[PDB]
């Protein structure tokens, strides 16, 4: 990924990931930029930060959202 390496994570969810998922990547760039580099950061995002973030659509924001709450709130052992 990133030119250089950082570390390692554990079971943590990056955006460009998460969002290839939804085909939302689109909105990467205004993610990551924002400051939103991982779930970490989306598990603070809400409807009204999509919109701010240029999601004035409903379809992605949703999708967003709805998607973030499935990886955050589902303890899911895998």
């Known amino acids: 990924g990133s030119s250089g390496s950082s570390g390692r994570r554990e079971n943590h969810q990056t955006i460009q990931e998460f ?14 930029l924002n400051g939103y580099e991982t779930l970490d950061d989306l598990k603070d995002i809400k409807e009204s ?3 701010e973030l240029n999601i004035a659509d409903p379809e992605d924001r949703a999708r967003l959202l709805s998607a973030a709450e499935s990886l955050l709130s ?3 052992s895998g």
């Open 49 to 51: 930060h999509l919109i």
């Open 74 to 76: 589902g303890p899911s």
């Open 19 to 32: 969002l290839e998922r939804i085909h939302l990547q689109e909105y990467t760039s205004t993610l990551l």
